[PDB]
Amino acid sequence: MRVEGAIGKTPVVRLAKVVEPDMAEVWVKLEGLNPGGSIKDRPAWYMIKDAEERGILRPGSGQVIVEPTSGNTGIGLAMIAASRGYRLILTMPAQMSEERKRVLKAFGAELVLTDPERRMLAAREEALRLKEELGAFMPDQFKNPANVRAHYETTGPELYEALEGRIDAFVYGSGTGGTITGVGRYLKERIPHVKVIAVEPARSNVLSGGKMGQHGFQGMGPGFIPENLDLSLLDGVIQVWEEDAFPLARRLAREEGLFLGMSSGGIVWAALQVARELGPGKRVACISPDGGWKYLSTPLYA
Amino acid sequence: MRVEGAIGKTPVVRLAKVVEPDMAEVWVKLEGLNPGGSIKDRPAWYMIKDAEERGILRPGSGQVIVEPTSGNTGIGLAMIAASRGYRLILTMPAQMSEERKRVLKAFGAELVLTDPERRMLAAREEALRLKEELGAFMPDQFKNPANVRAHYETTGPELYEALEGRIDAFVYGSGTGGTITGVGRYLKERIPHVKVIAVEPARSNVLSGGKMGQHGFQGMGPGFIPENLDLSLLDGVIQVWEEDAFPLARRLAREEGLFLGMSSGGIVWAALQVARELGPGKRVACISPDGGWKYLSTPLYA
Ligand SMILES: *Cc1c(COP(=O)(O)O)cnc(C)c1O
Ligand SMILES: *Cc1c(COP(=O)(O)O)cnc(C)c1O
């Protein structure tokens, strides 16, 4: 078996200290236990495997893959490209932290640093330029249906089975929209009453009708509504503040032994709010995108 | 289920790029996929659970646990203490990196920084002083039989089953000795011909009859022979150099998509040597103690 085969089948733990007796049960699926360190291993593998199935790619070819990302998707793609023999080029703003660059380069990804003033826009442009110049494959994480399918076929089934089909609400901090859409559809097809609640940064609350903005929940809240996010599935949107989520993340680490990422703090905080609303006999499920390992030099744990 | 329940059941992957056709198969069990980030989650949980079973401890009591370590064992103990409600105090030399200190403190562990000139000796002394002053529980990782038992009851069975009882050699870089002893005994009781090979730093080659010394394989090669290491189980000892292991670790990341720790590079390098000796039709199994996540600021990935 190769590393891509070690993706998924992650555990779900029930919170016991940060919750209160008047709250519904709160379960957290730990996606940080994936070989690539995050939930993005799933869509990274699926988008590449989907491309192979469609004939766009064939493993061990050395073909080029390009994507404008320096986040978990970049790490996941880098891992898969290293394992299956693809040349990966990742475009990103020149102000990228050395720590993250080292992780990507460790996997053999080639990095193209773009105009720091043009932020994501310049990264996207360079990725498109390379796709055109090299005839490369661009996963296109925000609009590729295979992203959603990864969660519809693996994440969703896993969560449903682990919790024995007993879930009253699913809470998640949306990034590309793949997870909430894939898991959301899977759960709604089987649980008539289940509520699907999206979580976003109050500082970049576009789903709530607000405005995009800079925030500290790395990995979630892209500042726009992605094509992979099915808005018709949502039963609500909860806005979260770093001021509330970071202290909660620290509590999870010290009280539950759960050392999670920045987005996890926001997601669990929202899940707790939902848990109090539903009450004692209910079950709230949410997902932790990644662990705290990549964030020791951030205000969350610094 | 709580975090301690998410420990174990780690995957095993077969190397395909760094190996050569004249080599036996090489399988690597990924212990970095544990909630605490390393194989030490197992002995940390077992030593604490063993103490509870013997009546020394009872969860949620706030009882004190003290251990002289800042490594993976410290992280594992911190995670378990946070989850089960114990007060953990870790003693370590004052020259400890801020990164590691942040991980331990994130889990709520109390840190006592000792004389930087007295290295491990001062850390051990303070731990003993606290055990005496507070009547605290000290896991004593290098001599506690529960460490070995964790691997005899979980790691060993898992490896054996995953590889369908087909293993010609087991290779591991010994630290406390728990893993090689536990897995080693489990395998030898079932596979008459299996060879158990220990790996140690050439720079601190005490098992080979050499002398202790400073080295870069964090987590392995303690510079002494621990009580938990059963020397009668060993069929050989392979000495490894950072000069050879670090480049190999980088190859594993770039070619196999396996981003592993410093000790993993040394262990796999040794496993390859054994694989070439055994040849094509055989199977060599080894274990990766942890991932590369905690080592981005080390010469391995910097
Ligand atoms: C990708 C990611 C998310 C969002 O998941 P999507 O399926 O992309 O919506 C949230 N947090 C982190 C840390 C992520 O990497
Ligand atoms: C603990 C550890 C080892 C050794 O395992 P033992 O069972 O203690 O022999 C090797 N490498 C790392 C990184 C470790 O943390």
Contact between B243 and B267 (Cβ < 8 Å): no
B177 marked as part of a ligand binding site: yes
Q: What is the DSSP letter of B235?
A: S
> In 10 A of CB A164, how many CB atoms?
8
Nearest partner of A128 among A116, A117, A112, judged by Cα = A112
A186 marked as part of a ligand binding site: no
Q: Which atom of ligand 1 is nearest to the CA of A176?
A: 8
Are residues A296 and B35, on separate chains, in Cβ contact within 8 Å? Answer: no
Residue at a domain's end among A88, A119, A141 = A141
CA quadruple B163, B36, A297, A72: dihedral sign: positive
Say yes or no: B160 and B281 in one domain: yes
Q: Which residue has the tokens 């059941």?
A: B9
CA quadruple B250, B256, B257, B262: dihedral sign: negative
User: Which of A9, A10, A13, A248 is most worth mutating to test chain B (most B CB atoms within 10 A of its CB)?
Assistant: A13
- Degrees, nearest 5: CA angle B180-B184-B186: 130
Q: Which two tokens stand for residue A237?
A: 């949107």
| Burial class of residue B152, CB neighbours in 10 A (0-12, 13-18, 19+) | buried
Residue of B nearest to A255 (CA): B82
Residues present in chain B in total:
302
* Sheet of A110-114, strand order: A64-67, A87-93, A110-114
Pairing, β B12-14 against β B25-30: antiparallel
Residue at a domain's end among A141, A165, A189 = A141
Q: How many CB pairs under 8 A join A and B?
A: 130
Ligand 1 pocket residue status of A263, Cβ below 6 Å: yes
The CA R_g of chain A, rounded to the nearest whole Å, is: 19
Contact between A238 and A199 (Cβ < 8 Å): yes
| Distance, CA of A117 to CA of A125 (rounded, Å) | 13
Say yes or no: B239 and B171 in one domain: yes
Upper half-sphere CA count for residue A115 (Cβ side, 13 Å): 10
Sequence-separated (6 or more) residues with CB below 8 Å from residue A141:
A43, A47, A67, A69, A73, A147, A176, A178, A228
Nearest partner of A61 among A135, A113, A124, A148, judged by Cα = A135
Q: Which two tokens stand for residue B235?
A: 């069929």
- End-to-end, the C-alpha distance of chain A in Å comes to 38
Q: Which two tokens stand for residue B172?
A: 């591991």
Point out the catalytic residue in the list A38, A204, A263, A264.
Answer: A263
Q: Which residue has the tokens 């709580």?
A: B2
Contact between A144 and A47 (Cβ < 8 Å): yes
Say yes or no: A295 and A242 in one domain: yes
Pairing, β A25-30 against β A12-14: antiparallel
- Degrees, nearest 5: CA angle A288-A290-A293: 135
Say yes or no: A269 and A195 in one domain: yes
Nearest partner of B147 among B107, B174, B124, judged by Cα = B174
- Read off φ and ψ for residue A172, nearest 5 degrees: -150, 145
| Distance, CA of B160 to CA of B157 (rounded, Å) | 5
Say yes or no: A171 and A224 in one domain: yes
Using a CB-CB distance cutoff of 8 angstroms, which residues of chain A are in contact with residue B80? Answer: 257
Tell me the residue type at B111. L
> In 10 A of CB A228, how many CB atoms?
25
In a domain, A184, yes or no: yes
Say yes or no: B191 and B238 in one domain: yes
- Degrees, nearest 5: CA angle A228-A29-B155: 130
CA dihedral B223, B228, B234, B237 (to 10 degrees): -20
What technique determined this structure? X-ray
Are residues B106 and A11, on separate chains, in Cβ contact within 8 Å? Answer: no
Query: Does B99 contact chain A (CB < 8 Å)?
Result: yes
Which residue range is the domain that position B23 belongs to?
1-33+155-302
Q: Which residue has the tokens 């509504």?
A: A225
Contact between B129 and B122 (Cβ < 8 Å): no
Residue at a domain's end among B141, B173, B206 = B141
Say yes or no: B196 and B296 in one domain: yes
Category of A295 on φ-ψ map: left (φ > 0), alpha (ψ -120 to 50) or beta: alpha
| Distance, CA of A32 to CA of B293 (rounded, Å) | 12
Positions of E strands within chain B: 12-14, 25-30, 64-67, 87-93, 110-114, 169-173, 195-201, 236-240, 283-288
Residues 118-147 of A with CB under 8 A from B: none
Contact between B66 and B134 (Cβ < 8 Å): yes
Positions of E strands within B78-216: 87-93, 110-114, 169-173, 195-201
Say yes or no: A264 and A167 in one domain: yes
Contact between A83 and A4 (Cβ < 8 Å): yes
| Distance, CA of B122 to CA of B125 (rounded, Å) | 5
Q: Which residue has the tokens 């990924």?
A: B30
- End-to-end, the C-alpha distance of chain B in Å comes to 38
In a domain, A146, yes or no: no
The strand pairing partners of A197, in sequence order, are A171, A236
In a domain, B278, yes or no: yes
Q: What is the DSSP letter of B141?
A: T
Distance from the alpha carbon of residue A32 to the mean position of ligand 1, in angstroms? 11
Q: Which atom of ligand 2 is nearest to the CA of B263?
A: 11
Q: Which two tokens stand for residue A8?
A: 């998924």
Q: What is the DSSP letter of B23?
A: S
Annotated active-site residue B263? The verdict is yes
In a domain, A27, yes or no: yes
Say yes or no: A29 and A174 in one domain: yes
Point out the catalytic residue in the list A40, A131, A195, A294.
Answer: A40
Q: Which residue has the tokens 């360079």?
A: A126
| Distance, CA of B134 to CA of A29 (rounded, Å) | 38
Say yes or no: A206 and A263 in one domain: yes
Point out the catalytic residue in the list B38, B70, B204, B263.
Answer: B263
Contact between A11 and A291 (Cβ < 8 Å): no
In a domain, A114, yes or no: yes
Where does chain B break, by residue before each gap (C–N > 2.5 Å)?
none
Ligand 2 pocket residue status of B181, Cβ below 6 Å: no
Question: A176 vs A39, A62, A79, A212, B35, CA distance in Å?
Answer: 12, 27, 19, 15, 25
Say yes or no: B91 and B235 in one domain: no
What is the nearest CA distance from B52 to chain A, expressed in angstroms? 18
In a domain, A149, yes or no: no
Q: Which two tokens stand for residue B216?
A: 């870069």
| Distance, CA of B70 to CA of B64 (rounded, Å) | 17
Helices of type H across chain A: 41-53, 72-84, 98-106, 119-134, 145-150, 156-162, 178-190, 242-251, 262-278
- The CATH number that applies at residue B109 is 3.40.50.1100
Residues present in chain A in total:
302
Q: Which residue has the tokens 């000790």?
A: B263
The domain total for chain A is: 2
In a domain, A216, yes or no: yes
Q: Which residue has the tokens 């996010």?
A: A229
| Burial class of residue A21, CB neighbours in 10 A (0-12, 13-18, 19+) | exposed
| Distance, CA of A99 to CA of A290 (rounded, Å) | 16
Are residues B106 and A293, on separate chains, in Cβ contact within 8 Å? Answer: no
Are residues A291 and B254, on separate chains, in Cβ contact within 8 Å? Answer: no
Q: Which of B16, B253, B293 sits opposite A2 (nearest CB)?
A: B16
Buried b (16+ CB within 10 A) or exposed e, A175-212: bbbbbbbbbbbbbbeebeebbbbbbbbbbbbbbeeeee
Q: Which residue has the tokens 């495997």?
A: A49
Nearest partner of B80 among B124, B35, B113, B121, judged by Cα = B35
Q: Which of B13, B107, B250 sits opposite A3 (nearest CB)?
A: B13
Say yes or no: B181 and B286 in one domain: yes
Sequence-separated (6 or more) residues with CB below 8 Å from residue B41:
B7, B8, B31, B34, B35, B76, B79, B80
In a domain, B148, yes or no: no
